Design a protein around this ligand. Structure first.
Ligand SMILES: [K+]
Ligand SMILES: [Mg+2]
Ligand SMILES: [Mg+2]
Ligand SMILES: [Mg+2]
Ligand SMILES: [Mg+2]
Ligand SMILES: [Mg+2]
Ligand SMILES: [Mg+2]
Ligand SMILES: [Mg+2]
Lengths: 83, 136, 293, 49, 112, 49
């Protein structure tokens, strides 16, 4: 096969110029997102519920074979998970 | 009829626009761009001069007795003229494989209207609007 | 679709059939050598006839008389047949109109092939046997084979008019089992195996009367002969070498007849169209003889 | 007009030739079976009777 | 294989998603510089269409992509691309069916 | 005379036609790269300045 992609991608163009596409958005469009987020009311509360469902319950870090990593970090042992 | 580009000569496309293309038997050998008329039952031959003999223009070269495609009314066509022609001239078969103007002929009514002018022996662009047959 | 009338059960329904018209006999694909051409125009190369070696003196220069060549050109003509119906007819018809028009268009192209074949075959045969009334049966077939054999070709096939078939099956040679060696002609007429195995010929191709181009049909300009066996000077059979008459078929898509059903993009018309290009050409017209009344 | 096979018949393609060549008239050949064949030692000779 | 495809759960959702939307999912095999296998890399399925042979087997892929107020275009051999078809006209069909284009009328009726 | 090309150039073989069409004149195309391209949603309009 090959060591670099040989199919093209649509994702090249005249930068943040006057054309319209989902990857071609301007700083004004970015500030439009910020305005929807800032301004509160029912729309902001729904998208906050979406963030809380996806990410609000917290997290855990695992390493496969963590105990085998055990090494002195600063005169005391840690595993990579502990670090 | 012929177009030149550099050293090369190319055949011209006789048909510019239109869908009114119809089939006949050739009554003699015919050349692309010649005007033709009904010489017999579904048979066509080269138009003589001064009207009463025009059904359409032959679209490609054929030998006698071969089936022939013909452009009739409602077609825009590239055709050779035997005299200078200008836009809005009415033209009709010259009796020489060419067209000529109604003004030059003995006839009083044409079969095609010149859309782009041309000199003697050049290719004009024209729109076919009438057939002519035997009225007596 | 939205049918205006429903069909009830127990065949209490309307009588829902169509009776067929006359169907013409189709044989050209079997009765000739078929060329499936790559191009709509083309050439078959023909070598010149055999000669006799030349008597020459001892130590003399041998003269050249090398093989020489010509072609017969094919120039296939587009046969076409078409039909157009409004969509209201398709919806409201007693039977499938598209199926019926497809069958009609297919048949009209086959009849077209057979007209081109028979008209070439009859007009351009180089030999003739004139019966002048008289011995028109087996003796005419034998004599026509004799006319081809006298040009040093061997025929293997015959093409026959309905009037000629009628005369032939009245011939005492074939009608009497004593004389035929079988009663197959008396019993089964044209379906008898001897009818396809007579006078050295190993195929019989039975034609219709209307197939030959009289020039009375629209778009067709007639052949030079009269196809028939009713009257003075009609030609009613051709006896010939099947490998020396070529039917050339050309189609821009596939090998054969192309049928296209289509809907009009504007007007609520549906149609079906058929195309084929065909030519027919003798390689050697001397390999063929007509039988004349 | 448009593009049609009679215009470009010798420009965008070539007319087919069959690769088979059709024979001319061939005469019947029988003499070697239909008679006794003598391979002579000399161009001129006699057979006694 | 579990090390060859570490994130197969994400790849399966992406390819399977594309193969339900489009007639096919499609992609490359990609290598490290050392020529060891790196990943199977999906391409953008709306940018690619197959060139089939007479018996309906894909021989090459034709790609058109947006570039700076116009389009690039290229052709690639089927020899180093792979494609997956969920929806088919027949088991012999290598081109497949989009459920979006199949139900275009229902989608438009809904939107209207 | 013998057998030679100019006798049989259309009876025993056919002239070669080269497989590739020579392209003729191509104009330089640049406007799509050399200007801002706007895909308008109406055939007529006004752009604010
Ligand atoms: K005059
Ligand atoms: Mg128009
Ligand atoms: Mg030729
Ligand atoms: Mg000498
Ligand atoms: Mg000689
Ligand atoms: Mg003779
Ligand atoms: Mg019976
Ligand atoms: Mg002696």
């Amino acid at each position: 096969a090959s060591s670099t992609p040989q199919t093209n991608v649509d994702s090249m163009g005249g930068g943040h110029s006057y054309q319209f596409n989902g990857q071609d958005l301007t700083f004004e469009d970015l500030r439009d997102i910020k305005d929807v987020r800032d301004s509160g009311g029912q729309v902001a509360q729904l998208m906050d519920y979406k963030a809380l469902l996806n990410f609000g319950e917290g997290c855990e870090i695992h390493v496969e074979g963590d105990d085998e990593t055990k090494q002195l970090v600063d005169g005391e042992p840690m595993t990579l998970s502990e670090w | 009829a012929t177009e030149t580009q550099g050293e090369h000569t190319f055949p011209v496309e006789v048909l510019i626009s239109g869908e009114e293309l119809r089939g006949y038997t050739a009554g003699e050998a015919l050349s692309a761009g010649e005007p033709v008329y009904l010489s017999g039952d579904y048979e066509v031959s080269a138009s003589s001069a001064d009207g009463g003999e025009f059904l359409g223009v032959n679209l490609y070269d054929v030998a006698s007795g071969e089936p022939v495609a013909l452009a009739g009314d409602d077609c825009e066509v590239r055709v050779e003229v035997s005299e200078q022609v200008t836009a809005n001239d009415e033209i009709l078969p010259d009796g020489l494989g060419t067209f000529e103007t109604v003004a030059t002929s003995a006839a009083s009514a044409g079969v095609a209207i010149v859309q782009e002018g041309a000199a003697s022996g050049e290719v004009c662009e024209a729109y076919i609007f009438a057939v002519q047959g035997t009225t007596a | 679709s939205d049918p205006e009338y429903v069909d009830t059960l127990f065949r209490e329904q309307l009588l829902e059939v169509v009776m067929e018209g006359r169907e013409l006999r189709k044989v050209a694909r079997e009765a000739s050598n078929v060329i499936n051409a790559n191009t709509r125009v083309g050439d078959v190369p023909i070598a010149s006839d055999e000669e006799f070696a030349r008597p020459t003196g001892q130590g003399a220069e041998i003269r050249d008389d090398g093989e020489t060549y010509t072609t017969v050109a094919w120039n296939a003509t587009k046969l076409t047949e078409g039909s157009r119906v409004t969509d209201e007819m398709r919806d409201q018809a007693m039977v499938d109109l598209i199926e019926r028009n497809i069958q009609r268009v297919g048949a009209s192209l086959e009849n077209g092939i057979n007209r081109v074949f028979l008209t070439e075959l009859v007009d351009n045969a180089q030999n003739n046997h004139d019966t002048a009334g008289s011995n028109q049966g087996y003796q005419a077939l034998n004599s026509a084979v004799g006319e081809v054999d006298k040009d040093d070709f061997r025929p293997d096939t015959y093409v026959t008019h309905p009037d000629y078939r009628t005369q032939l099956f009245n011939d005492t040679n074939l009608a009497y089992a004593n004389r035929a060696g079988t009663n197959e002609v008396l019993r089964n007429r044209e379906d008898a195996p001897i009818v396809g195995d007579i006078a050295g010929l190993d195929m019989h191709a039975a034609m219709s009367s209307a197939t030959y181009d009289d020039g009375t049909d629209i778009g067709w300009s007639g052949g030079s002969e009269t196809w028939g066996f009713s009257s003075d000077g009609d030609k009613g059979a051709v006896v010939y070498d099947r490998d020396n008459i070529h039917t050339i078929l050309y189609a821009p898509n596939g090998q054969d007849v192309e049928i296209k059903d289509y809907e009009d993009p504007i007007r609520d018309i549906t149609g079906v169209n058929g195309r084929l290009h065909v030519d027919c050409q003798y390689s050697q017209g001397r390999s063929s003889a007509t039988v004349q009344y | 007009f448009a593009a049609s096979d009679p215009e470009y018949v010798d420009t965008l393609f070539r007319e087919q030739l069959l690769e088979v060549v059709m024979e001319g008239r061939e005469l019947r050949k029988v003499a070697r079976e239909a008679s006794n064949v003598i391979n002579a030692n000399t161009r001129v000779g006699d057979v006694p009777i | 294989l579990e090390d060859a495809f570490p994130h197969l759960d994400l790849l399966v959702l992406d390819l399977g998603g594309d193969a339900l939307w489009y007639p096919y999912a499609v992609g490359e095999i990609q290598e490290t510089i050392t020529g060891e296998f790196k990943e199977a890399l999906p391409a953008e399925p709306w940018t690619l269409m197959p060139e089939s042979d007479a018996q309906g087997k894909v021989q090459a892929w034709h790609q058109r992509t947006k570039t700076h107020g116009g389009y690039q275009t290229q052709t690639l051999p089927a020899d180093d691309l792979w494609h997956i078809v969920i929806n088919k006209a027949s088991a012999r069909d290598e081109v497949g069916i989009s459920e979006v284009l199949r139900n275009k009328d229902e989608i438009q009726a809904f939107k209207q």
